[PDB]
Design a protein around this nucleic acid. Structure first.
Ligand SMILES: Cc1cn([C@H]2C[C@H](O)[C@@H](CO[P@](=O)(S)OP(=O)(O)OP(=O)(O)O)O2)c(=O)[nH]c1=O
Ligand SMILES: [Ca+2]
Ligand code: NA
Ligand code: NA
Ligand code: NA
Ligand code: NA
Length: 310
DNA sequence: CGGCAGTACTG
DNA sequence: CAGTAC
DNA sequence: GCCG
């Protein structure tokens, strides 16, 4: 990154807007920050800055102040509430609206939340695992988690295909959680297995809490056995084989990559989801046996998971 | 002016 | 539905 | 915040 003296300052503002709920301003910042991380050389001129896609007049003005000053004065006026709002919205299940409500009510610390806040079921689990869910795991541990789910699944039907997606599939050295996608080439067998699979993983002691238990996706909490283990976030999604390529694409990410591909698809009168690539308007589902087919139908060259890490 | 990705789950 | 998350 |  040629422009860390720039982006480090901008990321503080981005986070400030985000926790205060200014979704769209925060997005603009997020995009400019990556555009800046993706230019070869340091930004030298105002007109050099507008050259970058994602950098406008307002942003170029802030980059020049940073270069002539070494600082951005707006950082001096960030509200004192922001660190507390960040603390509260790092509870899984609490977002900006909950954080702002807790702040207005006078809460300032997780001890205040523990002792006086009304928590949803999900938020109580998030709070109990507050530190652990802020930590990333080595990818070797993600491998053990994927294999634990696969062994439990293949025990009930050896035809089940199980693939760890997210940052793991993109090749990262560390993973924030584990994303396991399950299907079956028979197009039928994947149906109704959650109650068995989760009971099996729960009967083990591996699954420690449930956050979301839907018909197709499970989000929860697991811990491998033995000493020195932390609780880890685990997501499991079960899909029909017809949807495997689009589900793999979605679940492998990155999030910014997905948003970018979906935006492109819409410019072309199409629509892309974890279920299907369609024509827009309903529309027609297009046949996508492989991830490569999704890229081809969008007129783009295939990208391996490692180069989707946007 | 107004979209900024599309969908699933909770209560 | 609004809120939250992947 | 940016951009069509
Ligand atoms: C947040 C988010 C995600 N997704 C997709 C792409 C992510 O890849 C995948 C898994 O979601 P995650 O576990 S949160 O993310 P990753 O594994 O990439 O990275 P880490 O966990 O190591 O932090 O769902 C998305 O379409 N829209 C989103 O808004
Ligand atoms: Ca993940
Ligand atoms: Na520009
Ligand atoms: Na949160
Ligand atoms: Na009080
Ligand atoms: Na996940």
């Amino acid at each position: 990154n040629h422009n860390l003296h720039i982006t480090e300052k901008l990321e503080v503002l981005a986070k400030a807007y985000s926790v205060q709920g200014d979704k769209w301003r925060a997005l603009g910042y997020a995009k400019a920050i990556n555009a800046l991380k993706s230019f070869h050389k340091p930004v030298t001129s105002y007109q050099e800055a507008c050259s970058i896609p994602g950098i406008g007049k307002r942003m170029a003005e802030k980059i020049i102040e940073i270069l002539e000053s070494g600082h951005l004065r707006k950082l001096d006026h960030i509200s004192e509430s922001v660190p507390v709002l960040e603390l509260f919205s790092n509870i899984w299940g609490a977002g900006t609206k909950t954080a702002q409500m807790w702040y207005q009510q006078g809460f300032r610390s997780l001890e205040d939340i523990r002792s006086q806040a009304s928590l949803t079921t999900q938020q109580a689990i998030g709070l109990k695992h507050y530190s652990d869910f802020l930590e990333r795991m080595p990818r070797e541990e993600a491998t053990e988690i994927e294999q634990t789910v696969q062994k439990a699944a293949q025990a009930f039907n050896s035809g089940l295909l199980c693939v760890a997606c997210g940052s793991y599939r993109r090749g990262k050295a560390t993973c924030g959680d584990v994303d396991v996608l399950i299907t079956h080439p028979d197009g039928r067998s994947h149906r109704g297995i959650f109650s068995r699979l989760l009971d099996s993983l729960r009967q083990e002691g591996f699954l420690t809490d449930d956050l979301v238990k839907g018909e197709t996706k499970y989000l929860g909490v697991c811990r491998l056995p033995g000493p020195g283990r932390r609780h880890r976030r685990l997501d499991i999604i079960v899909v029909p084989y017809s949807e495997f390529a689009c589900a793999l694409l979605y679940f492998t990410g990155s999030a910014h990559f997905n948003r970018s591909m979906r935006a492109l698809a819409k410019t072309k009168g199409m629509s892309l989801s974890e279920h299907a690539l369609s024509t827009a308007v309903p529309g027609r589902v297009l046949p996508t046996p492989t991830e490569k087919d999704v890229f081809r139908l969008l007129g783009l060259p295939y990208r391996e998971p490692a180069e989707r890490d946007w």
